[PDB]
């Protein structure tokens, strides 16, 4: 079996303005197999309430999934993406870079 | 409408 | 334009943990409308958009049915897989099934699909033509010589052109405030120096629907496919989707380069130069 890892993106639904409200996302695809955790972190504590899109897959067979949590940007929070899957030897934490 | 896949047996 | 309707559902045995995980869900174009969850309480079929959701107690009494009786079939394909391919039943397995149409502009049909993935790769999939199969391998043909025997192609070519397409076209017209919009990327470059000599240049598309888009960087109008970082088309969460497209480039050379957004919302593809 040939297994395949996640691409992973954190990004706003909008462009960040702190004290605007607005969504976190972290979109993981291109995967296989399927079973996977992905966790959103406020520095560098997991956020308690995330939500998740329903399991899909591209024409490539490949696993996709959107989590997703609203928020409010300021200054000084930083945020995080820590994605578990096999292929990975340890989990995956990728920092949220808001003016990319 | 999901399909009919009574017959989709390997 | 043309627009597509996918059932796609996701079967993921367990050992030791109980039945398979089954996961399906549906799909107007780039806009999910149904879904089941084995691991969900409600056990049914739910809706996902606003448009489905008129649908009557019947429609979901009989949507129900089916993919749960699916997910019954495809756990049992799953250990015929594992008879076929001679594996364990101590190792957690994958089944895809695919299946769907496509209706041109005029709402006529276009295309039908029908296709299984054990683990990730092909295992068996209905032809263009509707009339035959492509197995991936031995197993595989196992199973085509099965459902050459039983017809099975036949009353799927009849479906898919019939049932699948009316009621695509059903769908369009009940979701057609929303299902039949184009929204056109909003696009902006960013900037960013990354030593004294080299700067990022990245080129934005926000806020698009559908989700199909190209972004493109050229220098002094050449394609620079090999030097790109593209990063996959990913939905905001509203119903829209973003993508951008970044370059690396000498600092003072800004100008040479030009980023060009084709996508079905724009009177005319847009360039942009920093």
Not at chain 3, 1 to 9: D, E, L, V
Request: aromatic residues 12%.
């Amino acid at each position: 079996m040939i297994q395949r890892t996640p691409k992973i993106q954190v990004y706003s639904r909008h462009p960040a303005e702190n004290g605007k409200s607005n969504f976190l996302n972290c979109y993981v695809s291109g995967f296989h197999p399927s079973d996977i955790e992905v966790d959103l972190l406020k520095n560098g504590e997991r956020i308690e309430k995330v939500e998740h899109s329903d399991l899909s897959f591209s024409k490539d067979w490949s696993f996709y999934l959107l989590y997703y949590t609203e928020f409010t940007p300021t200054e000084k929070d930083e945020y995080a993406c820590r994605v578990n899957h096999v292929t990975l030897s340890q989990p995956k934490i990728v920092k949220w870079d808001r003016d990319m | 409408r999901f399909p009919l896949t009574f017959g989709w047996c390997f | 334009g043309s627009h597509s309707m996918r059932y796609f559902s996701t079967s993921v045995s367990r050992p030791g943990r109980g039945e398979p995980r089954f996961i399906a869900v549906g799909y107007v174009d780039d806009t999910q409308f149904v879904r089941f969850d084995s691991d969900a309480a409600s056990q049914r079929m739910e809706p996902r958009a606003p448009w489905i959701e008129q649908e009557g107690p019947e429609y979901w009494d009989e949507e129900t049915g089916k993919v749960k009786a699916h997910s019954q079939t495809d756990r049992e394909n799953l250990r015929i897989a594992l008879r076929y391919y001679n594996q364990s039943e101590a190792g957690s397995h994958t089944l895809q099934m695919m299946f769907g149409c496509d209706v041109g502009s005029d709402g006529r049909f276009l295309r039908g699909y029908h296709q299984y993935a054990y683990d990730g790769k092909d295992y068996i999939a209905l032809k263009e033509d509707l009339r035959s199969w492509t197995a991936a391998d031995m197993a595989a043909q196992i199973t085509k010589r099965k459902w050459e025997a039983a017809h099975v192609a036949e009353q799927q070519r009849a479906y898919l052109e019939g049932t699948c397409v009316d009621g695509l076209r059903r769908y369009l017209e009940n979701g057609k405030e929303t299902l039949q919009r184009t929204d056109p990327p909003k696009t902006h470059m960013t900037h960013h120096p990354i030593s004294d000599h080299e700067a990022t240049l990245r080129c934005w598309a926000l806020g698009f629907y559908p989700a199909e888009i190209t972004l493109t960087w050229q220098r002094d109008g050449e394609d620079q496919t090999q030097d790109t970082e593209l990063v996959e088309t990913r939905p905001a969460g509203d119903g829209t989707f973003q993508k951008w497209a970044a370059v690396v480039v000498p600092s003072g050379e800004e100008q040479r380069y030009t980023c060009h957004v084709q996508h079905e919302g724009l009177p005319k593809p847009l360039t942009l130069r920093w």
